[PDB]
């Protein structure tokens, strides 16, 4: 299909891949419990 | 009331109200050397005239979205709203498309607009929409209608981006009004008749000479000088002239007697200017006054009619031919006429 | 999905100002600034 490829290209142009990998790589802490109202 | 057919030359302008000042910026394309387009100042044409030669596009095909996707998955028509158009640059011959790379860093989501050679893909097509509620889809497009161009590939608007120096039209999601101004209606252009915006030269009846400037062997200050010359200069690049009409619409119509137009040198890019202390020379566009650089063609030597023609909004009438049409140059201020001199003294007459 | 994408790109204000716009860069700085606000109690309800 063509319009599917168009929508995929639109999403790719709107959201960069480097932003995604950087946001995935944050390595949140693993905590006596803590509060889960954060990342 | 005039409809927009196919195979006609148009100009795409827009209005920008920046820094509490309105301006009319048009879409231009260099074509050779670079791919991306840029902006041209149609307004403020009193001292700096716009290069109308590169701001000219031609609509080739007007297909619906169904027919477009169908041909992509595989005549004098009338422009209708909702259709998809193909804007071929008149000068470069390439086609207007939306690029994939980005140049203006203030939009991390927009794409640039430029030219490409092939017509394959959805990039070179642009779907047309109205900018008012009075005209719906399927209606016939006319002159003066505010139009919106959307990319068929990226589904982005032909947006007018603002910047300190990056005054560059982009493909963004914020729409922008665009005005269409015709130049040549694609109708019967009279063969052998002079048409506006043409690149031509002049010759004499029994002298076989042409109006030109010195060649590149001399400096630019010497090339600024103007004269007549014969021989191999009959077929040269430095012997051609362009009639740049002051109008932004229908300037490529049948040029009639008396109307003003600048004479641009295609090799130097300058205009034939005149300051009274001296004769006519060549000066750039950054200081081209309409009053100083405007000329006209008369059919006689008298001054019977000067301010008789004001404005004709149409293709005009086939009046001036090429071969048997004896014109006479006449300046709009002093009204002088061309004279050939004998600057070369008899000491060097048989030379150049 | 198609009409949702169309409406979202027609109205770009729906996206976050840190992601979309002439200001903020994108999700990385947005997310770390949000974390950093969550750690600093001076930017919440006292």
Swiss-Prot record, chain A:
Disruption phenotype: Embryonically lethal. Embryos die at about 10 dpc, due to defects in heart tube development. Cardiac myotubes display enlarged rough endoplasmic reticulum and cytoplasmic vesicles that contain high levels of Ca(2+).
Tissue specificity annotation: Highly expressed in heart, lung, cerebellum and brain. Detected at lower levels in adrenal gland, stomach, thymus, esophagus and ovary.
Localisation per UniProt entry: Sarcoplasmic reticulum membrane
PTM summary: Channel activity is modulated by phosphorylation. Phosphorylation is increased in failing heart, leading to calcium leaks and increased cytoplasmic Ca(2+) levels.
Recorded superkingdom: Eukaryota
Subunit field text: Homotetramer. Can also form heterotetramers with RYR1 and RYR3. Interacts with CALM and S100A1; these interactions regulate channel activity. Identified in a complex composed of RYR2, FKBP1B, PKA catalytic subunit, PRKAR2A, AKAP6, and the protein phosphatases PP2A and PP1. Interacts directly with FKBP1B, PKA, PP1 and PP2A. Interacts with FKBP1A and FKBP1B; these interactions may stabilize the channel in its closed state and prevent Ca(2+) leaks. Interacts with SELENON. Identified in a complex, composed of FSD2, CMYA5 and RYR2.
Role: Cytosolic calcium-activated calcium channel that mediates the release of Ca(2+) from the sarcoplasmic reticulum into the cytosol and thereby plays a key role in triggering cardiac muscle contraction. Aberrant channel activation can lead to cardiac arrhythmia. In cardiac myocytes, calcium release is triggered by increased Ca(2+) cytosolic levels due to activation of the L-type calcium channel CACNA1C. The calcium channel activity is modulated by formation of heterotetramers with RYR3. Required for cellular calcium ion homeostasis. Required for embryonic heart development.
Record's comment describing the protein's domains: The calcium release channel activity resides in the C-terminal region while the remaining part of the protein resides in the cytoplasm.
Family: Belongs to the ryanodine receptor (TC 1.A.3.1) family. RYR2 subfamily.
Name of the protein: Ryanodine receptor 2
The organism's taxonomic lineage, starting at the top: Eukaryota, Metazoa, Chordata, Craniata, Vertebrata
Full-length numbering of the shown residues: 2412 to 2459 of 4966
